[PDB]
């Protein structure tokens, strides 16, 4: 029945995934009592890929994990906090300290088990198994840290189920500590080995998009939320919702990803949040760098594929023409040895509060400029050796960094190759 | 330009109107199929061997 | 905006096409192999037109009409004209031509011996020999045509020399036939010699090239001058006595050619620019002696006639923000 | 009377065989129930719409088809929709999950697991056959599914059934209606395979269909609904000569005979005509000349390409309504002295014709209007071998860059299968062309 499991890891990844539950259990007429309330069955549809049916109570296939209890205390506490199933809370009492050996070698070392038997248990309740998403930060300890030992730990016992990431890339404009390159480049090569899909949410874009685009002179991390809460509500909207396409993780990631490695997608969104936007201004936003969430200038690289979906009412032969449009601006950012790598599809049921949308997933080589930017963070530091002691604390060798390192610099270089090509 | 071999019947007709004259066996299809499937097991044994080493690499740190 | 993609960079014709399209700023081109574009200024060679027409949502053109060769090569425009009814062996306007491969041998001989008191002067190419005996020009060839060289050729005064016609025409994606105003004379420098000598036999600018330039600039001379002459020297106009018969010959060539080639209803559109040559004899009757599908463009005539092309064939299909006459069909 | 067995794979061959069959029935006067009033042979009988029918004791014609999919959604639309009673549990076998557009998971990985479970509901039909002429397969050449498993299947068949012939009915890939970017892969891949299995394949170009939807139709954005409706009457119109009395086309062995002398060659180019909007209150009706002379204009072609600069092998006529053979020569004439007919000069220059008086059958509220005659061409000529070009100029592209390449080897596959088929092609399109070929 092509279900999909949720992991939320972390402060970052338990705070964007609990607003992804809210924004989605309003689409699926699903209240925070976990009880439908809706007005079409089309919200019914396609419930099982991310709810489970227990009293006619549809509960999320989510499992919360964290390394302290704030966070997740604050959830069950929030406005949908109650329709998350109790056994899937899984936390410790130490933290992470933002340390992503706390999070993969020691502290979370100790709990990761205690998650893998819910996951298990979530996993065998599926009919079919499409793979997980896991939400997650790559800049602290539990969500960069426990999260990709948590990725590895799946593909040891999941080898053919798919492993798709919402990422939460650092930036020291909104920054909480400055080991954050490091936790982040340390997390980087475990997702270029370990997911399929992994969507770049920069929170320099982020905080760009709050502030010089939304009005909003000081943005909170929950503003920058809702920009994630709603990106995510498009992206998968191809699986919740009944229309043009019908395709589960593995075809989406197929059709997307040419090389197993370059896997980093940009993500964009349109509107930006009374007057509905026309067809031409959707779609000469979400190709715009100003909507883009990864802090990444796609004229600075070249699209290898190119996916956008369109909710709401609206006539497909005037999109298919400003597609058109869009591409014949853009005709020489897009490779020319990957033929109709620009694919559009529809769904008929809008986000709330729009009465049209548009989502915008690229696979573009000028995402080597986040991994450079973080890379030159990282070295920054490194020649100097500085901050080391809290890793080395907890029995990492320095060779470790070095090796991090220069697996980001081959990162970078393999899409320069791609670049040039 | 004839008309040949004309056939009538309570459906139809049908004519001919010239204008010019002028495998593998079973066996060898198990066996590509299981050498494929073994090249699978193979990756995969080396993607869990991969995994293993990373586990080594975790207890030792 | 508009995209296009070059293909024939030693085209000098299509050279002039690009930058006069790129100087509108309404027009971006892109790389050789860029399958989106709207135009394609295809190469001479194996011009892939299975591959036009099928990128979703873009109109496309090509400066190219498939099977337009069978004009524009010498063996097939014999082989086109003698089993065409429309043309006919019985046509008027073209040379006694035969092919033969290194066939219509017998059939050469034939009419050959049934010359033999006519004048039996024939003309060999495909490289070019001109005899009175035909065992040398069947034996010189060991594909070619041989053809009946015209020995009373119309000379000009002074100078009592050869020359040909060059006429341009386009044929846009609607097949209407635009003849343009504009044509030239390639003359002969070299005074013509009815008695193996080539100089004043062929009329080529570079046979000429390698006299030359004494009586007009480049041995290229326009049909202002041209016209002028006939009206002194033998009291007719260019129109009269030999324009009737080019745009005769223009017509029924490609209206011949149209049900094969045309892209009226095709899921892509063709234009295409030819050079028809011609040649005049003492009698002012006209002679077509070739068509060419790419031919360059006198010097003077390069700007009116690569505008001309982007007015009527490019912009005519991809509109932005007459030196042709129209031979109606 | 000889049976044939369908066989429809993937989600484009399991709806268009819906498409398809929901057109036989209503041409043979057959119920969603099964029920066959004009039949009055209960239980039995070997009629010419036996071909495709089977009887039960109760009166219920069951289609000789067999449905398969590597995941249920699009199957279990035919177990809930209009004509479920038509099939029985047996005929409709679905997967748990798909080939996720990986002609090597299609073929190999979850191919290996179902191809027993296909074979042995295939000879639950076969079994049930006096004599069984062979198998007619719709797939599509992009899917997963319809490229991987089929050419399995056809090696399979091949075996089992070696004396059997095997037609297909190919959806060759447009990216207007689809949103994958592998497809030339899985083309190219399926295409190498199946080639020496296959007698006799018809493919049609969604690009084609789609522009006729538009065009002729009315249809802003066709769906696939309105595609298949129109791929079926195609099919319909291949097919009515193994379901009804005549003399041409009436088994397999012929569809081969009549047009396919060189047997790589077996892609025949079908052309349709007329194509008319219900919308239109009322149409002037063409005639026989009309029709015959719409089979030349590119615009019907199921296939984009140009006859004109390619050399025809083999010429079928099939009239469906007011037609006789008076109007068909005389517009036979008539053409030939305006389009350009090139035959190769070692096969005679004809048109082999057949005419069924009964008219097109249209779907009730459907999109095509009822016609008092209609016609489909069915001619071999080289210039189908545009479409081979096409895809595989689209196949080198990515190959160059081995783009995606590692989805394929992931499941199995090795690299040299793509080298392989793609040589293998490259001679296909060499075949065509020994066939039909500064100033
Ligand atoms: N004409 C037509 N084409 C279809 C239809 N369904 C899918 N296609 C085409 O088939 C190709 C995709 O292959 P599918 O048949 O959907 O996939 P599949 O055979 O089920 O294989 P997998 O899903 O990958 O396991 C695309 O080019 C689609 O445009 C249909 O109903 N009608
Ligand atoms: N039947 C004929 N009678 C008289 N002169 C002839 C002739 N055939 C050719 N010529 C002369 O020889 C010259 C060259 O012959 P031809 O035109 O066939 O070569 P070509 O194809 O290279 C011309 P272009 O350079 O435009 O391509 C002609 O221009 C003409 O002057
Ligand atoms: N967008 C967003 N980013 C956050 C949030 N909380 C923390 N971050 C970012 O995540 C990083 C800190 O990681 P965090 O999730 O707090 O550490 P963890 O709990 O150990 O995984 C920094 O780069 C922060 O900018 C949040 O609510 N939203
Ligand atoms: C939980 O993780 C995911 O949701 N992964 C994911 N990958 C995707 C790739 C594409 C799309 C589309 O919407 C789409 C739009 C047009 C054409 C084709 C596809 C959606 C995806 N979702
Ligand atoms: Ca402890
Ligand atoms: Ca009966
Ligand atoms: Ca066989
Ligand atoms: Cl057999
Ligand atoms: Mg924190
Ligand atoms: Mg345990
Ligand atoms: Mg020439
Ligand atoms: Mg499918
Ligand atoms: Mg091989």
Same mark, same amino acid.
């Given at each position: 029945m092509r279900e999909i499991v949720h992991i939320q890891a972390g402060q970052c990844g338990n705070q964007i995934g609990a607003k992804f539950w809210e924004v989605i259990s309003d689409e699926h007429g699903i209240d925070p009592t976990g009880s439908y309330h809706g007005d079409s069955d089309l919200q019914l549809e396609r419930i099982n890929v991310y709810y489970n049916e227990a009293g006619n109570k549809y509960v999320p296939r989510a499992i919360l994990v964290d390394l302290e209890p704030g966070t997740m205390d604050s959830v069950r506490s929030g406005?949908?906090?109650?329709?998350?199933?109790?056994?899937?809370?899984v936390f410790g009492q130490?933290? *992470?300290?933002?340390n992503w050996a706390k999070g993969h070698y020691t502290e979370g070392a100790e709990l990761v088990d205690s998650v893998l038997d819910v996951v298990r248990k979530e996993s065998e309740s599926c009919d079919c198994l499409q793979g997980f998403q896991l939400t997650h930060?790559?800049?602290?300890? @539990?969500?960069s840290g426990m999260g990709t030992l948590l990725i590895s730990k799946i593909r040891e016992e999941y080898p053919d189920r798919i492993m798709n990431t919402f990422s939460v890339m650092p930036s020291p404009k909104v920054?909480? @500590? %400055?080991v954050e390159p490091y936790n982040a480049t340390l997390s980087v090569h475990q997702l270029v080995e370990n997911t399929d899909e992994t969507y770049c949410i920069d929170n320099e874009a982020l905080y760009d998009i709050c502030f010089r685009?939304?009005?909003?002179?000081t943005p909170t991390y929950g503003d920058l939320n809702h920009l994630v809460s709603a990106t995510m509500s498009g992206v998968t909207t191809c699986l919740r919702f009944p229309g043009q396409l019908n395709a589960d993780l593995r075809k989406l990631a197929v059709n997307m990803v #040419?090389? #197993?490695?370059?896997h980093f997608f940009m993500p964009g969104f349109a509107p930006l949040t009374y007057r509905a936007l026309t067809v031409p201004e959707l779609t000469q936003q979400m190709f715009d760098?100003?909507?883009?969430? *990864? *802090?990444?200038?796609?004229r600075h690289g070249r699209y290898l594929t190119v996916a956008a979906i369109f909710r709401g009412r609206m006539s497909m032969k005037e999109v298919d023409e400003q597609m058109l449009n869009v591409q014949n601006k853009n005709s020489?950012?897009? %490779?020319?040895?990957?033929?109709?790598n620009v694919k559009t599809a529809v769904c008929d049921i809008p986000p709330r509060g729009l009465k049209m949308s548009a989502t915008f997933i690229g696979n573009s080589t000028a995402i080597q400029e986040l991994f450079k930017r973080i890379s030159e963070q990282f070295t920054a530091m490194f020649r100097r050796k500085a901050f080391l002691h809290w890793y080395t604390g907890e029995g990492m060798d320095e060779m470790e960094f070095t090796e991090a390192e220069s697996n980001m610099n081959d990162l970078v270089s393999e899409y320069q190759q791609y670049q040039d090509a | 330009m004839e008309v040949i071999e004309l056939n009538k019947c309570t459906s139809g007709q049908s004519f001919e109107v010239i204008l010019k004259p002028p495998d593998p066996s079973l066996e060898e299809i198990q066996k590509k199929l299981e050498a494929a499937e073994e090249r699978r097991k193979y990756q995969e044994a080396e993607l869990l061997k991969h995994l293993a080493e990373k586990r080594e690499h975790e207890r030792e740190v | 905006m508009y995209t296009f993609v070059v293909r024939?960079?030693?085209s000098s014709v299509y050279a002039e096409v690009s930058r006069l399209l790129l100087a509108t700023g309404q027009w971006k081109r892109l790389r050789k192999? =860029?399958?989106?574009? =709207?135009?394609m200024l295809g190469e001479? =060679?194996?011009?892939?037109?299975?591959?036009?027409?099928?990128?979703?949502g873009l109109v496309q053109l090509v400066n190219?009409?498939?099977?337009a060769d069978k004009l524009c090569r010498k063996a097939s425009l014999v082989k086109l004209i003698k089993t065409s009814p429309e043309l006919?062996?019985?046509?008027?306007?073209?040379?006694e031509s035969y092919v033969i491969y290194p066939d219509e041998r017998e059939v050469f001989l034939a009419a050959y011996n049934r010359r033999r008191r006519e004048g039996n002067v024939w003309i060999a190419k495909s490289g070019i020999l001109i005899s009175s005996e035909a065992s040398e020009l069947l034996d010189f060839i060991d594909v070619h045509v041989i053809q009946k060289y015209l020995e009373k050729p119309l000379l000009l005064e002074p100078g009592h020399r050869k020359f040909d016609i060059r006429s341009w025409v386009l044929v846009d994606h609607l097949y209407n036939i635009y003849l343009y105003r504009e044509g030239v004379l390639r003359t002969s420098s070299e005074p013509y010699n009815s008695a193996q000598d080539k100089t004043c036999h062929l009329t080529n600018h570079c046979i000429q090239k390698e =006299?030359?330039?004494?009586?007009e600039e480049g041995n290229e001379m326009f049909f202002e001058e041209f016209n002028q002459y006939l009206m002194d020297?033998?009291?007719?106009?260019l129109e009269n006595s030999i324009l009737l018969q080019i745009k005769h010959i223009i017509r029924s060539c490609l209206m011949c050619i149209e049900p094969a080639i045309?892209?009226?209803?095709?899921?892509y559109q063709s234009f295409q620019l030819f050079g028809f040559d011609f040649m005049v004899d003492e009698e002012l009757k006209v002679w077509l002696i070739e068509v060419n599908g790419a031919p360059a463009c006198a010097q003077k005539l390069y700007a009116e006639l690569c505008q001309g092309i982007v007015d009527v064939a490019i912009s005519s299909v991809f509109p932005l923000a007459s030196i042709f006459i129209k031979l109606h069909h | 009377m000889r049976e044939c067995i369908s066989i429809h794979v993937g989600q484009a061959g399991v709806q268009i065989g819906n498409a398809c069959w929901e057109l036989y029935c209503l041409e043979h006067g057959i119920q969603p129930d099964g029920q066959?009033?004009?039949?009055?042979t209960i239980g039995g009988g070997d009629d010419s719409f036996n071909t495709f029918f089977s009887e039960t004791g109760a009166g219920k014609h069951v289609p000789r088809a067999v449905f398969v999919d590597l995941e249920p959604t699009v199957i279990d639309e035919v177990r809930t929709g209009?004509?479920?009673?038509?099939?029985?549990?047996?005929?409709l076998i679905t997967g748990? /999950?798909?080939?996720?557009?990986n002609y090597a998971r299609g073929h190999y990985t979850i191919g290996k697991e179902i191809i027993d479970l296909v074979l042995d509901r295939i000879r639950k039909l076969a079994d049930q056959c006096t004599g069984l002429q062979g198998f007619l397969v719709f797939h599509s050449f992009g899917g997963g599914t319809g490229s991987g498993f089929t050419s399995l299947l056809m090696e399979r068949l091949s075996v089992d059934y070696g004396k059997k012939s095997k037609l297909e009915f190919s959806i060759y890939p447009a990216?207007?209606?689809?949103?994958?970017?592998?497809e030339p892969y899985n083309s190219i891949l399926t295409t190498h395979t199946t080639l020496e299995h296959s007698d006799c394949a018809f493919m049609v170009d969604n690009e084609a269909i789609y522009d006729i939807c538009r065009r002729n139709?009315?249809?802003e954005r066709p769906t696939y609904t309105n595609l298949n409706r129109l791929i079926s009457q195609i099919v319909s119109s291949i097919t009515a000569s193994l379901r009804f009395?005549?003399?041409?086309?009436?088994?397999?062995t012929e569809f081969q005979t009549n047009?396919?002398?060189?047997?790589?060659?077996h892609f025949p180019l079908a052309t349709y005509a007329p194509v008319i909007s219900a919308?239109?209150?009322?149409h002037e009706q063409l005639s026989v000349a009309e029709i015959t002379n719409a089979?030349?204009?590119?615009?019907?072609?199921m296939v984009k390409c140009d006859p004109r600069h390619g050399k025809y092998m083999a010429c079928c006529l099939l009239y469906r309504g007011d037609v006789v053979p008076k109007d068909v020569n005389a517009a036979i004439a008539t053409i030939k002295t305006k389009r350009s007919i090139q035959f190769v000069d070692?096969?005679?220059?004809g048109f082999k014709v057949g005419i069924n008086y009964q008219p097109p059958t249209v779907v009730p509220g459907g999109d095509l209007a009822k016609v008092q005659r209609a016609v489909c061409m069915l001619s071999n000529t080289t210039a189908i071998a545009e479409a081979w070009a096409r895809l595989d100029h689209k196949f080198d592209l990515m190959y160059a860059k081995r783009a995606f390449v590692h989805w394929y080897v992931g499941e199995?596959? /090795?690299?040299?299968e793509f080298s392989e088929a793609r040589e293998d092609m490259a001679a296909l399109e060499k075949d065509y062309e020994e066939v039909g070929v500064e100033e």
């Open positions: 406005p949908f906090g109650q329709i998350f199933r109790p056994d899937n809370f130490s933290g *992470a300290g933002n930060s790559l800049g602290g300890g @539990t969500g920054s909480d @500590t %400055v685009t939304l009005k909003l002179t #040419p090389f #197993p490695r370059l760098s100003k909507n883009m969430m *990864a *802090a990444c200038d796609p020489s950012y897009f %490779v020319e040895w990957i033929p109709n | - | 024939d960079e030693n192999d =860029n399958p989106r574009f =709207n135009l001479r =060679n194996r011009l892939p037109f299975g591959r036009l027409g099928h990128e979703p190219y009409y498939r099977g006919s062996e019985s046509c008027t306007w073209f040379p =006299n030359y330039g004494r009586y020297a033998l009291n007719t106009t045309s892209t009226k209803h095709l899921h | 066959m009033p004009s039949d009055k209009t004509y479920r009673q038509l099939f029985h549990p047996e005929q748990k /999950e798909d080939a996720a557009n990216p207007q209606v689809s949103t994958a970017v592998v139709l009315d249809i009395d005549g003399a041409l086309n009436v088994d397999l047009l396919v002398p060189y047997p790589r060659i919308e239109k209150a009322y089979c030349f204009e590119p615009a019907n072609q070692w096969c005679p220059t199995g596959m /090795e690299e040299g």
